[PDB]
Write a protein that binds this ligand. Sequence first.
Ligand SMILES: Nc1ncnc2c1ncn2[C@@H]1O[C@H](COP(=O)(O)OP(=O)(O)OC[C@H]2O[C@H](O)[C@H](O)[C@@H]2O)[C@@H](O)[C@H]1O
Ligand SMILES: NS(=O)(=O)c1cccc(S(=O)(=O)N2CCN(Cc3ccc(-c4ccccc4F)s3)CC2)c1
Ligand SMILES: [Cl-]
Ligand SMILES: [Cl-]
Ligand SMILES: [Cl-]
Ligand SMILES: [Zn+2]
Length: 282
Amino acid sequence: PFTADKGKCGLPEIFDPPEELERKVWELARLVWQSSSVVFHTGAGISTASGIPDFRGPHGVWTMEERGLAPKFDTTFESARPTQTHMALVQLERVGLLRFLVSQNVDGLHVRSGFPRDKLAELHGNMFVEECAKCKTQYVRDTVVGTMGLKATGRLCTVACRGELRDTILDWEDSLPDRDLALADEASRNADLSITLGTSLQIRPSGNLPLATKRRGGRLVIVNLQPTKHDRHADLRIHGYVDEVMTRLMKHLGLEIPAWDGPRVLERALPPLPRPPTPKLE
Ligand SMILES: Nc1ncnc2c1ncn2[C@@H]1O[C@H](COP(=O)(O)OP(=O)(O)OC[C@H]2O[C@H](O)[C@H](O)[C@@H]2O)[C@@H](O)[C@H]1O
Ligand SMILES: NS(=O)(=O)c1cccc(S(=O)(=O)N2CCN(Cc3ccc(-c4ccccc4F)s3)CC2)c1
Ligand SMILES: [Cl-]
Ligand SMILES: [Cl-]
Ligand SMILES: [Cl-]
Ligand SMILES: [Zn+2]
């Protein structure tokens, strides 16, 4: 825990020049249009533009720790707003262009954005979510559950049970929630496109799930400012801010990024909305 391997921290950032970046976002649009089953994989890099530091970026939590400095938050977890990237992912789900969403983020922003929980794997937990040790019933709270490491929060279950409520935040030694990992793995294996956004892909098994898409000739896109463990395996690497990438992608797909209503929980994916017709590609 003190000696936990925190991987490669503070690698230099890469920036694709504008013409190369424009061309790669067009090729990402082409891959989205051609794919039957698209799975997105998100890490800490998609929440940096809302004031939450990443882990291994230049000013990441682990990077700063390694250099004897402190990470900086420009928000509380409760005051954090979903990024343009978060809200793009909401819309891509609503119009049927995203099949499943796998996140290593504990910041609760996917849930609070209104993204449907039945199409989301939270592989490392959710700091707003406590779970009954007895009945396994989950509670999505409006404030952060004040513990980490799957500890008693002090609250009891209110299901018609008085079980011990615990946080869902994995410690270094804790294996992943079985249901979330099973769904994430099935979604990744059956995908013909996996797109990774703001993750360095260094954590097993989370960072390995996008490689499962490469089985049976699936395509892998990696969007990230730094190198990632799997750059070698990517059909397309995009070195740019994820909000710039996703806003230009939505524009190519003819989709608007929806307004955020404030924190809202949606358990189940609503029926698919109309989407624009597909361009002639070939
Ligand atoms: N706006 C941005 N646009 C694009 N890339 C970005 C942006 N901001 C940051 N990045 C990149 O985003 C990447 C974020 O990589 P890491 O910091 O390793 O986060 P993880 O989610 O993969 O960490 C996995 C677990 O490890 C921890 O112990 C926790 O348990 C985590 O759940 C970097 O490479 C940045 O270059
Ligand atoms: N990604 S994010 O936007 O939700 C984010 C970004 C920065 C800081 C936070 S945090 O303040 O809520 N916090 C900082 C300390 N972490 C300790 C860990 C304990 C165990 C860990 C672990 C579990 C399983 C596999 C591998 C692992 F490394 S990581 C927990 C999150 C959240
Ligand atoms: Cl907070
Ligand atoms: Cl909808
Ligand atoms: Cl912890
Ligand atoms: Zn209970």
